Structure 1
Amino acid sequence: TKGILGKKVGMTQIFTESGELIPVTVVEATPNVVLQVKTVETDGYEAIQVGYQDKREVLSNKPAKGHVAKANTAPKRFIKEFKNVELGEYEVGKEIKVDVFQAGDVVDVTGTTKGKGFQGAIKRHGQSRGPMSHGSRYHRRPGSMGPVAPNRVFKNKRLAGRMGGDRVTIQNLEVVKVDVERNVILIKGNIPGAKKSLITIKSAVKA
């Protein structure tokens, strides 16, 4: 239901009111413009478009500025949706500010990972080595392709092929502060993402 996108800044520490150290990430936000309302009568499901930043006017198109123009804002970059929300309560062109997650405290964080190029068959899957001495020649290889009888190779025998670039949720994290005047949520733990990327933040599914 509750949902705010945003950026990724870095890592900090916070003493809580009992005095314990806690590792803390930093997520920003902005004003938060609702773009369309999708109904069953026209689209067969129910959702809400949402998008967070301000492009310059040089960097968009006449279709984008026609699509934004029923909310009277600048053209915005990161347009996404949100499902599973009971609507009411949502006009075209509102602002879903940082106020929503004051005591939410259980949150799914869905970033997108880094990227690491081609890498070996170990670093994807943790397959162990072979021996580095006693005469061998089998230091860092991906194993054997299977048995002999089927005259082929089965599928999902994992080999080399680029690390990272796919999107990963993490379930059931806590919220520490909500700083409305500076547009910052603080989260315990670790968010998948490079800096300046997107991060979606939702109220968690598993209660």
Structure 2
Amino acid sequence: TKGILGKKVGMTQIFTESGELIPVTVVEATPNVVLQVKTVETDGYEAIQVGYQDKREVLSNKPAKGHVAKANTAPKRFIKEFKNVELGEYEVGKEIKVDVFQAGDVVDVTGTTKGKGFQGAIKRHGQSRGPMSHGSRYHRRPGSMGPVAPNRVFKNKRLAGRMGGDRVTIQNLEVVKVDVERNVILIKGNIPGAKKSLITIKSAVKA
């Protein structure tokens, strides 16, 4: 249905009408452009291809310019597909701007979490330590690997490894304010990801 792509700027505060303080996250989204329309006769399902964030032109190649030429735009940096939206009602060239949402509008928000590197079982999985005194030599370790009988370790025995960097969505957040001349949405709470990272905002699945 409704849905837009933008970038993450940062967090701030705001007072409401009644005079309550509320933490917020600024998202900036210049106008998105519809590049392609997928149908059942051609593709086998129904969707919409959207682009965001204009790109300098030494940085693209000839196949990309050909794909962006039928829509009369500059080459884009981020291209996603938006599903479950009554097609009609849409055509290549159209611009989706932030006034698609209004204040209220419980929404879903997705991103890619920050990266953290190679991490141990205690930080990565919330596992608890061993004792720090009393003759102990077992501080920061992942536990026993299993029982003796099967002569092997089972799967989903959790260990150390690379942490972060996965996609995550958070459900049922509120739009606090929409500003049109600046292409800005204010969302109540915190979102996943670092600064300048891609963010997607859709109307909520659980309604």
- TM-score, normalised on structure 2? 0.99
CA displacement at 1:133 relative to structure 2: 0.2
Gaps of at least 5 residues in structure 2 are none
CA displacement at 1:31 relative to structure 2: 1.6
User: In the alignment, which residue of structure 2 is the partner of 1:34?
Assistant: 34
Change (3 A) 1:104 1:71: farther
Q: Deviations over 1:156-194 (max 9, x none)?
A: 000011111110000000001000011000000010010
CA displacement at 1:45 relative to structure 2: 0.3
CA displacement at 1:104 relative to structure 2: 5.2
CA displacement at 1:5 relative to structure 2: 0.6
Is the 1:104–1:203 Cα contact (8 Å) retained in structure 2?
A: no
CA displacement at 1:83 relative to structure 2: 0.7
Q: Deviations over 1:12-49 (max 9, x none)?
A: 00000000000000000112100000000000100000
- Looking at secondary structure, tell me which structure has more strand per residue: 2
Is the 1:50–1:80 Cα contact (8 Å) retained in structure 2?
A: yes
The number of aligned residues is: 207
CA distance in 2 between counterparts of 1:63 and 1:204 reads 35
Runs of 4+ in structure 1 off by over 3 angstroms are none
Is the 2:103–2:177 Cα contact (8 Å) retained in structure 1?
A: no
Q: Secondary structure at the match of 1:138?
A: coil
User: In the alignment, which residue of structure 2 is the partner of 1:133?
Assistant: 133
CA displacement at 1:96 relative to structure 2: 0.5
- TM-score, normalised on structure 1? 0.99
CA distance in 2 between counterparts of 1:104 and 1:4 reads 16
CA distance in 2 between counterparts of 1:175 and 1:103 reads 5
CA distance in 2 between counterparts of 1:70 and 1:104 reads 36
**RMSD over equivalenced CA pairs, Å:** 0.7
User: In the alignment, which residue of structure 2 is the partner of 1:80?
Assistant: 80
CA distance in 2 between counterparts of 1:88 and 1:115 reads 40
Q: Secondary structure at the match of 1:108?
A: strand
CA displacement at 1:103 relative to structure 2: 4.0
- State the percentage of identical aligned residues: 100
Q: Deviations over 1:132-175 (max 9, x none)?
A: 00001000000000000000100000001111111000000000
Matched, 1:121 2:115: no
